[PDB]
Design a protein around this ligand. Structure first.
Ligand SMILES: [Mg+2]
Ligand SMILES: [Mg+2]
Ligand SMILES: [Mg+2]
Ligand SMILES: [Mg+2]
Ligand SMILES: [Mg+2]
Ligand SMILES: [Mg+2]
Ligand SMILES: [Mg+2]
Ligand SMILES: [Mg+2]
Ligand SMILES: [Mg+2]
Ligand SMILES: [Mg+2]
Ligand SMILES: [Mg+2]
Ligand SMILES: [Mg+2]
Ligand SMILES: [Mg+2]
Ligand SMILES: [Mg+2]
Ligand SMILES: [Mg+2]
Ligand SMILES: [Mg+2]
Ligand SMILES: [Mg+2]
Ligand SMILES: [Mg+2]
Ligand SMILES: [Mg+2]
Ligand SMILES: [Mg+2]
Ligand SMILES: [Mg+2]
Ligand SMILES: [Mg+2]
Ligand SMILES: [Zn+2]
Ligand SMILES: [Zn+2]
Ligand SMILES: [Zn+2]
Lengths: 51, 104, 232, 81, 91, 97, 135
RNA sequence: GGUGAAAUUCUUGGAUUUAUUGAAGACUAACAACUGCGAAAGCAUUCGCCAAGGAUGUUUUCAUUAAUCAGGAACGAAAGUUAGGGGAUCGAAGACGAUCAGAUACCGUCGUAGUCUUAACCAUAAACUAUGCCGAUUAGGGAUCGGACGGCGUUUAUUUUUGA
C-alpha cells in the first residue's frame, strides 16, 4: 500500500481508489512519484507522467 | 613594452581565476585584478550621536558599526579618485600610504 | 508626488465611506517560557473578536523577535536574538515557547577577519520529545602571545579533524534531553566551552559559538506540557 | 672566498651539508641494540626501520615506522652500536 | 575486405529514407542484435526475443529489460537509490 | 578482502587443488579436504547442498566475493569456475585464519 | 483607544526604514510584523520626483510618523535599517540617517539599532552584462 | 518604478511596503593572500565510495633500460551543431520609451535562441611568461608552502611522546 512508502520512490499501476486494480502509470517506461503524506485524514500527493 | 612587471594583475602560478562583479558599473573583472577597499564606519554620522545617545532607554549606549567591502574595476577606480596616476619611478611602490595620525 | 496619478482608482471606481479602522482593535499582553527571567515582553494588536471571525484564530501563529539581553536582564547576551511562538490565549494573555535562535548581524561580521581560518559545521538532532531541530557551529583560529609569524592558518587535514569533533560533541549533548532542558544549556553556552576543551590538542581554536538553531518538526500540541512551564 | 682550501673542509662545516653533497657521500643512519624490559635478549634494529619490529621473546612491539626515524616504545632503552 | 566505409549494418536500406534517418536507426539496431553476458550463469549468450524480453540460451532464464538494451540508465539509477535509501533509513 | 587474491596464487604454485563441482564433491566424501571456495553467482540450490556436505565433514567454507568468471581468472586459468577444494596448503597460510 | 498601562511603563514598537537610492520608506508595526500602524514614503512630501530620496524629504516623512503614532500610545521604537540588498548596492541611501534623527528629536524613544540588509550566500546573475553600464 | 533629468510600464479589481509558509531551477559571498594542485584547458559548501599523483625519508631492488622528436595518436575555455530532459535568473535577434540635425547605438521597460544537464560532433582564443625541452657553471639578502633532522622554554589535555 502507498502509505508504507517513503517519499521520492517511483511506483507503477497505482489504484485511483483502493480496490479497483490499477489505473495510473502502466505504459512502457512510465511511473509515478510520491511527494508527501498527510498522516491525519490519510491522503497522499502524487505526480503523474503528464506533470 | 611592458608597463608593469606583474602585468598589473597579481596572478602567477595558476591558469584561471573566477571573475567578480564591479560594485559600481557591474562589470566583470578577475578577482585578483580588482581594487578592494575594506571600510568600518558607524551607523550614524558623528554629529547625530548625541541626539541618539540621550534619547536611548539603556543609560549609556554604543551605536553599532557597519562593515563593507567595496571592489571596483580600474576604469571606475580612477574616476572616483580611489587611486590616481603615479610617476614612472613611483609606480613600483606597494606600501600602503601613511594615514595622517596628527591631523594638524 | 501629488500630480502624477493618471489612472488613479482604475477603470471605474468611487470613494470610500468608513475610515479609521483602529477603533476596533484590542491589545494583549505577551508572556515568556519558564527558563527566562522576565516574562512580560510587550504588547500586540489585533481586530476585536466578532461573529464569523474569532480573535484567537489570528493569535496562534505569530512569532516575536526578543533580544536575549531583555529576557535575562543582562547586557552580556546583547548579540543573540530568539523567537517566541504563541500557542494558547488565556484572558488577555498570550503564551509562547521556544522557536529558534540567531546572532545579530553586526556581531558575526566583526568575528570574521583576514589571515585566520574559519571552521563551520552543522548537524540535525532529535530530542526525547520528538522535536526535529538543527544546530550550527562556528569557530576561528587563535593567535599565540609570543607569535611572530603574520598568519595563523590550520591545515585542511586538521580542519576535518575539528569538524568531526564538533559533530560528535553536539550529538552527545543533545542525545538525551528535552526542549526545556536543551534551552537551559544554550544560554550559558555550555556547548561552546566543552568543544574548546576537547579540540585543544588539535589546535587552540578561539571563539567557539553556536551560530543559530531552527526546528523542523513538532509533536502533538499537548496542552498539559505548555502550562507546566508557564504560570509559575 | 676567492682563496679557499677545498681539499680539507672543517668537520663542523661538513655536518650541515646534505648527505649526498659532501666531498664523499656517507650515510647518517646507524644500527642499535634495544633492551626490552620484559626479556633479557638483544635485538638489532635499524634507526629508520619501515616495519613494525617484534621481539623474539614475549612478542612485544619495539618501534613504530614514521616519515623519518622510527620512534621507540617509551619503556625501552637502546645503545648505538 | 571491409565491404563498407561508413554505412555499416544499415546497408540493406540502399539509397532510401534519407541519410539522417538511416543513422538514427543504425544506432538502435546495433545494440539489439548483439549478445550480452548472463547475470546468473555467466555465459555469453543472452538475446532479445520480444520488444522488451531477453532470455538466456543456456540456463533458460527470462528477464524483462529495455526496448533495445538489457537495462536502461533510468532503471539502473533507481536500484542504487532504492538500495541506499532502504538500508540507511531502516538499518 | 584483497589478501585472498595473493594467498590463492601461491597455493597454485606450491600446493595442490582441484577445480570444478563433481571433483569437489568427490574430495568431500574422502574427508581429506581442508577448505572449499564458493562463487557469488552459483545456483542457490547448489550452494546449500555444498554447505551441508561441509557441515557433515566439518571443514571450513569461504564465500568468494566475485562471480564465477573472476574466480577462474584468480587462479591463472582461462575458463569459468564456481567451486574448488584445497587438498593441502603449500607454503601459504590460508588455513591460519 | 490605547493600551492601558501605568505612567512609569512605556510600550514599544518597531520602525522598519527601507532607504534605497531612489526613495525612502518609513514603516511602523507592532512588536511582531503582522500589524501595520503607520507608513509614509518620501514621495508623498516632494513633488519633483528627483528629490524623493533627498534627506530633507526623509525628515518631513519621519516627523508626521511621530505625530500619528503619538496618540496610539506607543512611545518607544526599535530600528531596523536595510538597503536594497540582494544584487543591489548594500549601502543605505542618503535618507537612511536623516529619518533616524527626526524620530529622536520629535520625542520618541529609541533602542536596539540594527541592519537587516539581505545578503546572498551565492547569487544569481546580476543585471547589466559583462561590460557594465557604459555611461 | 527608473534616470544626469524624463518617459514607456504597474496601481484603491489594493500596486510598492510588512510578517509567516510552499515549489522550482541556477550559483557557492565574507574567510581568500604577490597562497595551494594539475600535461595544458582548468579546479572552492558537507560527508561516503573508487582508482591515480608529486615531494621528502631509506646501509631495500634492477643495471644503461636514457634525451629530443618529421608523419601518427589522447585531452582541448567560450560561442556554435544534432537528439531527449530542464527552463528560476540574465539575455544575441525582435518590439516599444527617451536622447539627437539624424541614432537601425550608448541610457530605460519587456523579451526568443542561448545560459544548466545526459548521449554524440566541432578543434579554434591576446589558448600569454607574447620567452620550446634536457644538462653544467656563475652573487648578496630576507619572507613564504610541503617533508626530514637538532635545541632552551611557554601552553596544554587521563596530560607524558605527539599538536600549537
Ligand atoms: Mg480502468
Ligand atoms: Mg605547476
Ligand atoms: Mg588562459
Ligand atoms: Mg526617484
Ligand atoms: Mg567614461
Ligand atoms: Mg499589499
Ligand atoms: Mg535547491
Ligand atoms: Mg591553501
Ligand atoms: Mg563558502
Ligand atoms: Mg608533429
Ligand atoms: Mg564548450
Ligand atoms: Mg553551448
Ligand atoms: Mg523527434
Ligand atoms: Mg535543447
Ligand atoms: Mg530580463
Ligand atoms: Mg536592436
Ligand atoms: Mg593559432
Ligand atoms: Mg604564440
Ligand atoms: Mg640566490
Ligand atoms: Mg625568517
Ligand atoms: Mg618547513
Ligand atoms: Mg622538532
Ligand atoms: Zn566599475
Ligand atoms: Zn620481554
Ligand atoms: Zn544464463
Amino acid at each position: 500500500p502507498l502509505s508504507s512508502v517513503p517519499e521520492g520512490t517511483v511506483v507503477s499501476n497505482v489504484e485511483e481508489k483502493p480496490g479497483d486494480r490499477g489505473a495510473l502509470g502502466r505504459t512502457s517506461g512510465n511511473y509515478v512519484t510520491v511527494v508527501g503524506h498527510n498522516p491525519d485524514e490519510g491522503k497522499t500527493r502524487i505526480k503523474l507522467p503528464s506533470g | 613594452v611592458k608597463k608593469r612587471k606583474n602585468n598589473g594583475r597579481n596572478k602567477k602560478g595558476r591558469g584561471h581565476v573566477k571573475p567578480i562583479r564591479c560594485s559600481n558599473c557591474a562589470r566583470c573583472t578577475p578577482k585578483d585584478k580588482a581594487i578592494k577597499r575594506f571600510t568600518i564606519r558607524n551607523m550614524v554620522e558623528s554629529a547625530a550621536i548625541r541626539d541618539i545617545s540621550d534619547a536611548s532607554v539603556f543609560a549609556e549606549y554604543t551605536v553599532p558599526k557597519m562593515y563593507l567591502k567595496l571592489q571596483y574595476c580600474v576604469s571606475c577606480a580612477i574616476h572616483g579618485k580611489i587611486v590616481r596616476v603615479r610617476s614612472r619611478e613611483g609606480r613600483r611602490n606597494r606600501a600602503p600610504p601613511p594615514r595622517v595620525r596628527y591631523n594638524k | 508626488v501629488g500630480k502624477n496619478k493618471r489612472l488613479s482608482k482604475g477603470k471605474k471606481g468611487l470613494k470610500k465611506k468608513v475610515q479609521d479602522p483602529f477603533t476596533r482593535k484590542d491589545w494583549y499582553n505577551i508572556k515568556a517560557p519558564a527558563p527566562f527571567a522576565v516574562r512580560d515582553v510587550g504588547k500586540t494588536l489585533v481586530n476585536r473578536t466578532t461573529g464569523l471571525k474569532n480573535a484567537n484564530d489570528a493569535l496562534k501563529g505569530r512569532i516575536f523577535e526578543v533580544c536575549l539581553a531583555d529576557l535575562q536582564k543582562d547586557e552580556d547576551h546583547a548579540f543573540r536574538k530568539i523567537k517566541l511562538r504563541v500557542d494558547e490565549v488565556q484572558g488577555k494573555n498570550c503564551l509562547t515557547n521556544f522557536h529558534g535562535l540567531d546572532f545579530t548581524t553586526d556581531k558575526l561580521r566583526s568575528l570574521v577577519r583576514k589571515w585566520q581560518t574559519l571552521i563551520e559545521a552543522n548537524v540535525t538532532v532529535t530530542t526525547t520529545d520528538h522535536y526535529l531541530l538543527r544546530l550550527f557551529a562556528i569557530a576561528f583560529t587563535k593567535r599565540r602571545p609570543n607569535q611572530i609569524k603574520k598568519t595563523t592558518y590550520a591545515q585542511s587535514s586538521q580542519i576535518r579533524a575539528i569538524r568531526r569533533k564538533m559533530v560528535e560533541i553536539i550529538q552527545r549533548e543533545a542525545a538525551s534531553c528535552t526542549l526545556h532542558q536543551l534551552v537551559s544549556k544554550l544560554i550559558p553556552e555550555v556547548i561552546g566551552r566543552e568543544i574548546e576543551k576537547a579540540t585543544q590538542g588539535i589546535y587552540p581554536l578561539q571563539n567557539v559559538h553556536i551560530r543559530k538553531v531552527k526546528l523542523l518538526k513538532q509533536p502533538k500540541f499537548d496542552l498539559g506540557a505548555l502550562m507546566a512551564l508557564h504560570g509559575e | 672566498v676567492l682563496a679557499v682550501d677545498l681539499l680539507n673542509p672543517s668537520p663542523a662545516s661538513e655536518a650541515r651539508k646534505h648527505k649526498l653533497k659532501t666531498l664523499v657521500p656517507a650515510p647518517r643512519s646507524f644500527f642499535m641494540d634495544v633492551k626490552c624490559p620484559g626479556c633479557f635478549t638483544i635485538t638489532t634494529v635499524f634507526s629508520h626501520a619501515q616495519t613494525v619490529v617484534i621481539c623474539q621473546g614475549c612478542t612485544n612491539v619495539l618501534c613504530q615506522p614514521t616519515g623519518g626515524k622510527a620512534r621507540l616504545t617509551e619503556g625501552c632503552s637502546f645503545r648505538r652500536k | 575486405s571491409k565491404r563498407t566505409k561508413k554505412v555499416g549494418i544499415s546497408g540493406k536500406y540502399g539509397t532510401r529514407y534519407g541519410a539522417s534517418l538511416r543513422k538514427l536507426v543504425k544506432k538502435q539496431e546495433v545494440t539489439q542484435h548483439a549478445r550480452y553476458t548472463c547475470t546468473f550463469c555467466g555465459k555469453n549468450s543472452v538475446r532479445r526475443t520480444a520488444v522488451g524480453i531477453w532470455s538466456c540460451k543456456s540456463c533458460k532464464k527470462t528477464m524483462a529489460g529495455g526496448a533495445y538494451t538489457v537495462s536502461t540508465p533510468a532503471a539502473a539509477a533507481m536500484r542504487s537509490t532504492l538500495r541506499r535509501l532502504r538500508e540507511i533509513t531502516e538499518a | 578482502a584483497q589478501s585472498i587474491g595473493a594467498k590463492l596464487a601461491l597455493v597454485i604454485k606450491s600446493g595442490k587443488v582441484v577445480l570444478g563441482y563433481r571433483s569437489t564433491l568427490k574430495a568431500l566424501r574422502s574427508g581429506k579436504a581442508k577448505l572449499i571456495l564458493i562463487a557469488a553467482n552459483t545456483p542457490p540450490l547448489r550452494k546449500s547442498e555444498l554447505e551441508y556436505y561441509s557441515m557433515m565433514s566439518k571443514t571450513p567454507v569461504h564465500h568468494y566475493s566475485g562471480t564465477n568468471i573472476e574466480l577462474g581468472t584468480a587462479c591463472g586459468k582461462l575458463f569459468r569456475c564456481s567451486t574448488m577444494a584445497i587438498l593441502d596448503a603449500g607454503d601459504s597460510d590460508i588455513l591460519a585464519d | 483607544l490605547g493600551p492601558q498601562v501605568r505612567e512609569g511603563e512605556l510600550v514599544f514598537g518597531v520602525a522598519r526604514i527601507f532607504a534605497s537610492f531612489n526613495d525612502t520608506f518609513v514603516h511602523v508595526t507592532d512588536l511582531s510584523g503582522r500589524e501595520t500602524i503607520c507608513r509614509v514614503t518620501g514621495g508623498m512630501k516632494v513633488k519633483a520626483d528627483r528629490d524623493e530620496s533627498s534627506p530633507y524629504a526623509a525628515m518631513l516623512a519621519a516627523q508626521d510618523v511621530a505625530a500619528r503614532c503619538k496618540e496610539l500610545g506607543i512611545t518607544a521604537l526599535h530600528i531596523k535599517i536595510r538597503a536594497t540588498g540582494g544584487n543591489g548596492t548594500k549601502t543605505p541611501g542618503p535618507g537612511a540617517q536623516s529619518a533616524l534623527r527626526a524620530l529622536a528629536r520629535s520625542g520618541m524613544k529609541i533602542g536596539r539599532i540594527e541592519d537587516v540588509t539581505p545578503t546572498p550566500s551565492d547569487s544569481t546573475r546580476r543585471k547589466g552584462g559583462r561590460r557594465g553600464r557604459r555611461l
